[PDB]
């Protein structure tokens, strides 16, 4: 790896610093991008890795994790916490999913190429240098500009029933209203046999207040679950529920796709209950006089996990992803 | 105007067609952009002009007017209704506020120049050709990608000021807030209402509901279709609460570029001195976020859009009773 | 004008040089673009102005005029010929209709703004400095990337019948197969100068017959105006003795694309067509199953402009039909 | 492959649907582009793969294959016909040779990389998943925006048994001429019979090109015994079938030494002679400067003719073909 | 003007703040750009206006003015000093001459349009709101990315002979080594009959250490000259001269022009004496094997005022501009 | 390689031509870029490979090498000289460091991929086809638009002491005022193949450095003389008086003055100037702010400025100076 980092991850105490990722530009051939990293190590216990900003426009983890990284102290800690709140820095500056450097979706570039373009090199550092240190990974996402999402965690239905149990338990600990079992960074975590949670904590290009609340509590809840900091998870839900309701997305049927490009009007938001064969929304063809909207229907019973982001949708886009009980 | 339209606006009945706006592209020197226009004219009464999509990322108006354009029949009409739901077609196609043709904010180009670039040409067409026909104008906006907005009308001679408050009341939005298109309507002395029906780059379900109804109420109010404005509110209220934005203190401004986390949403009540939010500097380890305060009491009208804000952006605009 | 030119247009003989048009770039604040101008002046007679490359992607005028500018001798001339084969130099370098400098179609910028952006400044120079010297303008165009065109002259119906016949006469001398009755041409006309336009190809390519007709036409115009010796030569490839006068005047002449997609034509420019016959089809290759949309001609005539790009955009004309004048 | 396809290529009957290729955009991270596929399978026989739109600006395959796909009936078929008229959908939408997604010329991306950018992923789908099902591939091209081309098939000089089968398929196609990391490079590596076509260019739709292309793909199905009938290969000038030609030497290429405005003396399909003038590069930016004359260096027929008026140094402005010889 | 400013330019004391220029973006329809303005007013005397950053890539004014703005105290002042070190904020942030907002050279946009695009709007604010207050204007430039310049002031040959002499006097007071005599800012200052100095204090896309020194001292000198702060101008020159030398650029002959695009190698830098007929440099054609470079010659005796910037020059660029002794 | 070249590198005499690199454009699918290559072969001796314009905005190698390529004759030569003055032709045309074809920094692309994008395919041709013919390589660079640099040669520290002596000696013969000892660059390819490798830094600031052109033109002749390919002995006299090259080095993180913030950087020194640890390197001004004081930066090594600030507006994470110190073996 060409990405330089001087942090001693074996050292007791707190270190807050940067990994320095080389970046060549026309007027800065030897330029660097500074990726914030904080590590708190003390006492005895497991390593929790918290990442945010893998996509530049996904704010909730950037906020939750940098806030924690400023405040967390060695004497609060039994084990180790590694925090990278803002991984894809170039993309964070442009507030986009894709890299303004090489156009790549970094979360389609793992495990990476140490000699590749920026996103490939960064993917490689993450998977090869940072990740092997982790006992558990929480990679914090939202839908960015693509959809809204109802605050939630997510995981894969694992082969190993033991690992499957631990990830479920960690997700219950995290305590979002829902947990959804479903070349990404998470594919790397899973391939190394490390427990893997992701989150979906908003979107619509905006900051989700409830998403931030849920995500800040979530990462503390995981540190408590893992016994890295004192206490037990606070998992109470605003509509009365005492904890996380497990869900799944396994069926082509769970997706409402747009057949044509146009202006899509939805009938429901995320978190709302929906049933099969009924109206999901209409694609209006505002370009035409007289022409009637094209009705879309859900083809699943369940609840809306992702709902329509941009008003103007392109053929091939999902306008809704419906989740159902696990 | 260079923009051609064959519609006979004085003809009784229904005409649905297009204004043909010329556009030169590198592989289409003689290309045209087709702007939808629908006109219903029957009997006797005034002209209502309904415009939407002046900005391309402002949907609710394109939805409400295009749905009404499709369904309104001459029989229910006393007077005349002109309906252009999708004014700025190039920007509608790109989903942006600004034109992909000439880079302009068309809503900074009025009264417009018939010899100018695309947006200036189109601005001139709307003001010089279409607008002189109207007795009231309802111009439908939302905050698009810049903000979110709580469903509302807006506006700004006490007699004509009354007729405007009355038109707004009929519209029936929860709130009416006292070189744009609406500056042309006003200059010409025509009743002028705007709306702010949403934002966050998304389609607002209530914004659509409110706006679909608001436009029917305007026709009722003006005696063009039968009935009375249905102005009942979801919060209990009998109708529109008139509000104002005037003080420089109403705007919560961002002093620095960074990641803005709000404390409140649009529609929510706010007090002077309380925390509006923080700008986070995620580029830095160890750096604390910059806290921002409201300076006014009232309710959030416009609230933060993009997570990453630029120095000199507003992150909240507060309204208060008129 | 900010555009400098040291050419003395009243001096006998030959001057070949440039108008220097200021162009501010990020690494060249004081940069200039050189616009070729050749003037030949001798004896007594009228002034002929020949322009090409007003659109960067329209080649035949660039070729025909630059060729004549190189070859024409002051002893052959009685009067004055002013030759600008390559007007819109930045667009010529990008091979585009629109300016890579300010994005403008210069032929929507006349009479121009001397304090405007580059295309407006250049429009002003052409109308205010160059054009007033002219007794006749031939502005050489083609359809560039937009269409193909059958080799032809064009002109406006002048309400004044006297200038109308004078213009018809010049067009007949030019001797293209067909003459069809804020652009540069509108300026020529507002100044009471005889104005001919041409359409000598397109399809993003150089048209061999277009070049031939264009080179001959400008010689013919010189002869017509008495500026060089000889009488116009106007015989046509398909045997006709002279130009046939034509017109386009009805909305019906245009075959418009209702939808964006892949347009397949039935005829090329130059071909006779009849009302209600198939003009072609818009295929929707993004769709399985979906049948193409058939389009019809709405007039009888000869195709003047035919489909350019395979993929057409809603609102594009895919044919323009001309009829006998 | 990440490109999902529900089509069962073993099922008798007709399936017309899409390959769903992942395309992450800034406001559509889970977006898809739908690539039209139609398969017809019936009875007993070989598989014919027909592809068009590998380059977005080459129209004649998109028209001919999508037209056949809509109309061809499983009952008519003894074998299997897989039809993708519109392969490079993003480039098709932009009307460009190169991809607007990743800037790649997909026909420089084969065999492909399933973990690569969009064009690499698509190329891998085409070579790995689609292609191995074929006994013969016809990949339909034109010169798009780069040149015009005289209507023709093309193929590589190969193994006399494979060469004979390929030449026989070319003859059946019946274009006026057949000219002996691309897609066709994969077809050949796999030992599948591979035909290409060149059915126009000049950024436009070529009427004869569409006619010849439509007839050609029917003729191949007939040749293969896949549908009933015998190939119809008669030519407008009177010839009974295709005339074999070759492009083999550097001499066959007229090269632009300088950037300028190229005026040709000939078009595609026309006969030319060594030492005759090919055209002139004009320097319209200069007064006084004479245009640069270019010469042909081989006798033959123009196969590819100049496209854009403004040519760049290092561009070919003509490719001359000559009668085929069996001896290479 | 749509550009807002709450500063009371008639108030005694120091106000440091911003003009708020509206900038509509796709995700910020109601955005603003904040343009730094510092006013120091005290006692009695004339108003000095100091502007930098009219071009985003000309640094020396930005540095000198923002530094003075930070430090200058009302108690030191008799009159009024208005300081905008960073006028063209969007171009400053992109480090370009041209605006990334509307593509304009702001210095081709004066006197401006209050209803125009951003640069036209800003140009109109500066001319119509700020400039009428000034008794003297120093507008600080450098050659940015286009050239290097030898540190200097500049002015025009004014038709008003008394204002001409006052400007020459002002130039001498500024004390740069050299002072060199319609839509620019300075053209507006001159139309309003205000004393106008420009500067040229570097370029080459870099920060010129002597350019900063001379520029910082220059602006203090003008204040002393105008009587606004105490003291006598410091005009000692590094090579021993007592003060500024008046020079001029007046004829076409003064400009060495590139006839061709290529790689320009100069023989001299700014500040260097050159003679007529001597070699100015060579344009290399690195794209060619064998081709000799094109020799360019100076056509006037004098000193190089602007020297070549970019190595790769475009046909029509100036590659040297020679100044000669001033004559009234 | 898809890059075609007809030059017979084993043939005596002079061949001046082009390698033809395929470059697919929307209106030229079969387009090519011509990369100039001149080879002079005569008699008996080692092969010297001279490359310039690996970055399009680094001019001094393009001038020095194309000039030598035009003038050099087979009869003055004992061995073989291969000259590519203008390697990255598209970036040369755009006057940029990065490629306008694929946006790559070609010098982060070696050893390259013959099936990749343009810059990758060009990097492969240079390493696999041209580079193996060489006994020594001089790859001529400058700081382009990024920095200025004081005219100098450069080389890595080679663990191998005999190679180090051999490379040090070639640097001495080249005869720039300074030689600076300091994975996907072209030089790393030369090094991997165990060929003597020199770099240069002959200027920058977006401009043509007159002294840089002079030192580069002389240095390549000197290198040829050193290797015994042409007659004579190196000329190593320095403008400032010195008899030859002074060896220096860059080894410590403390050698780099880094910008912690984006802003307008005002330097205190140019390249070539002596500096002291703890003293002021310059200030980052925040011209977007009223009242705000600039941020002072300090040098953290005694020495001579090797690379100095380029752009006025610097970005957080850029170096604004790199200090070199006397060489210690
Ligand atoms: Ca994500
Ligand atoms: Ca709006
Ligand atoms: Ca034209
Ligand atoms: Ca092709
Ligand atoms: Ca300037
Ligand atoms: Ca370099």
UniProtKB/TrEMBL annotation, chain B:
- Renumbered to this chain, the signal peptide range is none
Keyword Kinase assigned? no
The chain positions of domain Succinylglutamate desuccinylase/Aspartoacylase catalytic read 45-221
InterPro entries linked:
AstE_AspA_cat, N-alpha-Ac-DABA-like, N-alpha-Ac-DABA_deacetylase
Q: Which UniProt keywords apply?
A: Calcium, Hydrolase, Metal-binding, Plasmid, Zinc
Q: Which CDD domains match?
A: M14_ASTE_ASPA-like
> Membrane-crossing residues?
none
Q: Which GO terms describe its molecular function?
A: hydrolase activity, acting on carbon-nitrogen (but not peptide) bonds, in linear amides; hydrolase activity, acting on ester bonds; metal ion binding
Cofactor dependency: Zn(2+)
For this protein, the record's Pfam families field holds:
AstE_AspA_cat
Could you say which residues bind Ca(2+) here?
A: 55, 58, 141
User: What is the protein's given name?
Assistant: Succinylglutamatedesuccinylase/aspartoacylase
């Amino acid at each position: 790896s060409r990405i330089a980092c001087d942090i001693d991850f074996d050292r007791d105490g707190r270190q807050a610093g940067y990994a320095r990722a080389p970046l060549s530009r026309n007027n800065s051939g030897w330029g660097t991008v500074e990726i914030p990293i904080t590590v708190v190590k003390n006492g005895s216990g497991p390593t929790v890795l918290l990442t945010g900003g893998v996509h530049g426009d996904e704010y909730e983890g950037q906020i939750a994790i940098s806030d924690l990284a400023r405040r967390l102290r060695p004497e609060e800690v039994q084990g180790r916490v590694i925090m990278l709140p803002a991984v894809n820095m170039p993309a964070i500056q442009s507030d986009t999913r894709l890299s303004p450097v090489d156009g790549r979706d970094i979360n389609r570039c793992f495990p990476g190429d140490p000699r590749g373009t920026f996103s490939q090199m960064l993917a490689h550092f993450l998977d090869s240098v940072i990740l092997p240190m982790a006992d558990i990974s929480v990679d914090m996402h939202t839908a960015g500009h693509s959809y809204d999402s109802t605050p939630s965690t997510n995981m894969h239905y694992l082969a190993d029933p033991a690992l499957r149990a631990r990830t479920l338990a960690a997700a219950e600990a995290f305590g979002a209203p829902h947990n959804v079992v479903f070349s990404t960074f998470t594919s790397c975590v899973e391939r190394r046999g490390i427990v893997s949670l992701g989150t979906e904590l908003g979107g619509w290009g905006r900051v989700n207040i409830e998403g931030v609340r849920i995500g800040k509590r979530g990462i503390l809840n995981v540190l408590k679950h893992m016994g890295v900091i004192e206490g037990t998870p606070e998992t109470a839900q605003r509509g009365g529920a005492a904890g996380t309701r497990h869900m799944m997305v396994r069926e082509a049927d769970a997706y409402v796709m747009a057949p044509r490009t146009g202006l899509f009007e939805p009938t429901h938001y995320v978190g709302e209950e929906v049933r099969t064969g009924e109206t999901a929304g209409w694609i209006h063809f505002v370009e035409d006089v007289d022409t009637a909207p094209l009705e879309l229907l859900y083809r699943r019973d369940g609840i809306v996990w992702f709902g329509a982001g941009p008003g103007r949708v392109t053929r091939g886009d999902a306008v809704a992803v419906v989740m159902e009980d696990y």
